[PDB]
Write a protein that binds this ligand. Structure first.
Ligand SMILES: *Cc1c(COP(=O)(O)O)cnc(C)c1O
Ligand SMILES: *Cc1c(COP(=O)(O)O)cnc(C)c1O
Ligand SMILES: *Cc1c(COP(=O)(O)O)cnc(C)c1O
Lengths: 390, 390, 376, 376
């Protein structure tokens, strides 16, 4: 019942930005151009300064656009740099509405930093249309959403938000598509103005690159954003560019497997007597399940659950994992487990967390590409060991 | 007559941050750790790294080395020099004023003028070369003073110690010195009263024209924490490979900067004696207006030589076109010599630039590490091809 | 009905050698250690790293992972597949004979015939496609037997286990199997009785077409020790960064190989359907003359498809020249699809290295190229 | 009084092979080209070879995965039944390869004191095909008359002279200028200078020799990683400033040690007390940071001395930016037979320094304090 997979996705992942006719070599894999300057044929003149920038950032960028079905893509030092740059599209007096449940670092940036520079920040859910409709003002100029949301995996109707945000006039809708990747979801096809990623996660997928990507269609938006790319200089390294472009080549066969494993894990957890509740859009227990099948071609490896009992039971459970690793980050090849309230989302004010449901009993799992059976044995084994009140 | 060289510079460039006891292998050169996360013994720890962005072994060594070379207690690395500036100005709030030196690098000019001002920051450009003008320009709302010495490209020299006294006399206002041209080998703005010593590492620090990078050295405790927080929240972070590479560059900073100074001196002297040259602006020359100041605040000079060819734009252009060794290009500080025409190239971002004396006639040389005789022979030939009215 | 997929492969591909308890930082992904020397506590202490040659953290993790993936005790990493072949042969001495396969990779061929022979090693070549032929060739001086399966490009399959009994009956001889074109996901020569399981990692292991790297997996204690000595003393050694990149690529070997197989199968069945294709050679087809051996010996197949087009060389060229998705290039085992005319093994033989692009597209491109060759 | 510096060295280290017109980007620093496939050697290696060629005053250069793999490729020029003559004090590894590996494949190995030209001339056999020289030698710093050797070896036909120039680098010594046939480097040392690349370099002029080498570089497959090539080429850009600071620092350290009453004897080419000092000046533009000496007393004193170094590091390599110390008889030259070392002067009491680029005052202080501690 899912949206049928995007035609040509793998072919494009492999071949776009990657044409051999580009180099004197004819090489299949693009060379890494570390250099910061370029010889000019005459003063008023190709490439001129690496930060503006360069061959390897450009290849990555043509490829990510393609996969997003976009005309343009822009690459940054990190997902937060992408965010901070995106917010620089605005001015003092502007308002930003932000999905109430959102990456820790995003919350922090909007609440404690952008609010210092004449920007009004409102937190809204935004998974409920009429609340968003209410919060919009003549001052509103950016609407930032995430779906599913990190860590609670609330799911927003993107085309729904798109239609309503664009009725009001000149308002930019950004969708942070970190969790799903353009393999499973194309915010731009659903009417978003920007589709943004922390490429640190699934896009690169190999836990060895920190990076941001922003994809766009609108001509004037692209130009304004390109300016900010050069002017803020929050730019990724050419080597980082390369590694990430290398990671994309397997995005499709990585996301499929995250899908299989994720799904199995969420099914196993939901049948387990020691688990209170499982949130995973791929399950029919998910309140937005039907929506998910309309917006997405599948699901990812992110499974969040509440363990029965207290933080002490959550801790014993984490401490007994022998294959999942207790760490921050996600979307890598390796399975990771996490206690958002005290780790990844510690920078979200305690009251904000509790309204959100980020309790001491919430675990976020990032299901990796290991054997299903082993991920399953490890979870069984750890939950047995915690044995909370049933 | 220069300040004596800083005592343990060469030793510190090679050892600080670099202790083998840090690694289980006892490696003499720090490993490149690309890893995006790290395993945690327990949820919510004090100890160890947690997330690369915040963050990491290879960046942290580099930061430790640079701090030492700046004579500072802390350093922070960033994706670019520009991002280092953006982060620094995020230190402030709406209603605050920044005062900026007048001939400043084109990019810092643009960000302050065209981006920072749209967020309730008042930007004033002041010829801080005339100390009393700075004292006059200071208002209750003044939070940051941004200074560059020598200035790129006209190379006015600012009395850091004199500015520092004035900027510190009343209120709580920060003095940044962009020390990109000098490197901490030739000038220590912190020793002279600046609150922050900032680098575009892309230039001399790295020296090999293959890393874009920024650096902020700082002593003050609460200013550091305020910076550290922004480094993490805005995420304009550098790649670990770039960190590795830049730290690798630093190992020869002393031997490179000595050669830039020898070669730089010889080129300047040669230009001053040449009938086709109108004026040579070079700190190491008796003819530079702030020459004696240069000797009180610096242990030496750099490979940045600027002069005005006699005649017209056509003459500048022809001279540039005839260079066979010097390359026509936009960066600086590398191992190879670069020639540039600020008006139409690096400083394209007109009025203010006529006032500053960035005319058609003006040429910026970045003298590199090639053989002096060859450098001289290249200039000669090229000046001869243009043969301006003498 | 292939061999069951080897248990825990994906899990070991991802975790063996990657234990974060190795690094003071507990990094989840091993640091790249470029360091050439290591501080020593006292002169000639027994312990730890001393010289990168020799070797080093990053190389060491890769060796541990590959060994696990081959189901071997040990592995040694080399600057390339040829360099591995050379180190392996430095295992011998003047007066020894090596026996090599008939249809062996051009590289190992060139080195044996043109270089190794010059130093008192008899090389003599043999069709191992038939086991009694290998019997006959064995000599009181036979010290090494070099096999490669499936062969490239005619794709003949060699009964590995069969050759192992024949060869091991005569003392003291090493069986090397070049597993470059299967990868340990699909074939484990050591579990089959080979003494050595050799790779050119340049191909499928790394699969990203941006590393040259050889790999030797071994079980036997003395043979490992001998090999390690040649690793350090001849110095045909991998850069730590290549080590890293190949380890990075390993992390997706399982999902990459399933897709190569899936796509290769689809291409093979498409060609076997097409009236303009004389003949398809692909081990996953019931039409392949060693198909049964394949299912007893492998867990599946690869993206390598060979075919003969109807007509002549002209028709082969028109096809190759009209490919829009498949690239004309001389390599294989990467994520991209490559086509090649291996003679320029008759006028008419075409080799495909089928990649990870969309099935529909690969099929449409072939179909369109065959039509250009043979109109309407 | 040394040979005058080579004109254009710096200019050429920075620009040769570095021409921006080679790339569509017009990049000032050459890309790192990682590919192993090409749409119908690699650019990053090629740039490095050209630069080293220029620095050596050579027509050609070949890059290898280590200096050890360069030595092996070279020996592969010969056939069984031929003879190698090697300098009697070589790098432990060169000694090991010749004595323990090469000798197993029909080659005859002979060691000779070539610092005594009379002895080399007597040693030459109708089937000598290669003479292998290191100067100054590692670690006893014995110096050979390259030119005098060259004339002696070329007097009767088809013998190759290799000069291992690792210690000097082409900034201080150009063996090819002096009549050598091959100028060989472990680039792992001074050439890269940054302690993070393992590599070998071979420079040659002779046309037939190069084609032979080029053949072997391809067939043996001990090629370096393109990334490593990038990194070494990057190191080269500071060769002249590095080698000049090594010279000052080395010199100051030799002087200090020679004046220190706890030091029995110092061996350093830049000192008048070196028996070949005068030769060093006719043959070289300067000296390096390699300073070897004998501490007064027994093994205990050497050991206590090493334990108290606080700036120099106890490690097993050389020629990098960091100051290094080792005790050859126990570390770096354990692979040379005990009886070999005694004859060679590698005793319990010989310490080899690699002086780096730290401030001179600190290095002298660290040695002062270490010697005081060993001898109160
Ligand atoms: C981690 C994350 C980010 C920020 O990306 P970085 O590269 O870590 O700065 C943004 N959005 C989401 C949903 C994330 O999970
Ligand atoms: C180039 C430069 C900067 C910032 O440049 P980046 O290219 O973003 O590293 C800052 N100050 C000076 C003097 C510069 O030349
Ligand atoms: C170390 C060394 C070698 C061997 O080179 P590697 O890069 O260690 O394989 C050869 N010659 C000399 C003089 C050396 O010091």
């Amino acid at each position: 019942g899912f949206l049928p997979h995007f035609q040509h996705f793998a072919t494009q992942a492999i071949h776009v930005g990657q044409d051999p006719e580009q180099w004197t070599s004819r090489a299949v894999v693009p060379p890494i151009s570390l250099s910061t300057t370029f010889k000019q044929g005459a003063p008023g003149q190709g490439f001129e300064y690496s930060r503006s920038g360069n061959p390897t950032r450009n290849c990555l960028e043509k490829a990510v656009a393609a996969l997003d079905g976009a005309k343009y893509c822009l690459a940054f030092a990190s997902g937060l740099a992408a965010t901070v740059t995106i917010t620089h599209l605005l001015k003092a007096g502007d308002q930003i509405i932000c999905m109430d449940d959102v990456y820790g670092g995003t919350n922090r940036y909007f609440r404690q930093v952008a609010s210092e520079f004449g920007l009004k920040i409102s937190f809204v859910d935004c998974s409920k249309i009429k609340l968003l409709e209410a919060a919009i003002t003549p001052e509103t100029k950016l609407v930032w959403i995430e779906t599913p949301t990190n860590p609670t995996q609330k799911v927003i109707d993107i085309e729904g938000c798109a239609h309503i945000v664009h009725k009001h006039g000149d308002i930019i809708l950004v969708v942070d598509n970190t969790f799903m990747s353009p393999y499973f979801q194309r915010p731009l096809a659903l009417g978003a103005d920007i589709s943004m990623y922390s490429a640190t996660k699934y896009m690169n997928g190999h836990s060895d690159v920190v990076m941001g990507l922003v994809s766009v269609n609108c001509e004037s938006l692209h130009n304004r954003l390109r300016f900010l790319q050069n002017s803020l200089g929050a730019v990724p390294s050419p080597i980082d560019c390369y590694l990430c472009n290398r990671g994309l080549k397997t995005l499709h066969v990585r996301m499929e497997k995250h899908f299989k494993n994720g799904m199995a894990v969420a099914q196993f957890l939901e049948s387990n007597p020691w688990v209170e509740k499982v949130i995973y859009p791929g399950l029919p227990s998910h309140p937005q399940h039907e929506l998910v099948k309309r917006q997405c071609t599948g699901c990812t490896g992110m499974v969040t659950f509440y363990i029965k009992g207290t933080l002490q039971h959550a801790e014993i459970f984490l401490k007994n994992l022998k294959l999942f690793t207790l760490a921050e980050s996600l979307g890598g090849f390796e399975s990771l487990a996490e206690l958002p309230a005290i780790m990844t989302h510690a920078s979200v004010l305690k009251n904000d967390r509790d309204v959100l449901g980020i309790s001491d009993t919430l675990i976020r799992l990032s299901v990796g590409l290991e054997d299903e059976e082993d991920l399953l044995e490890d979870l069984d084994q750890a939950l047995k060991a915690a044995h909370p009140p049933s």
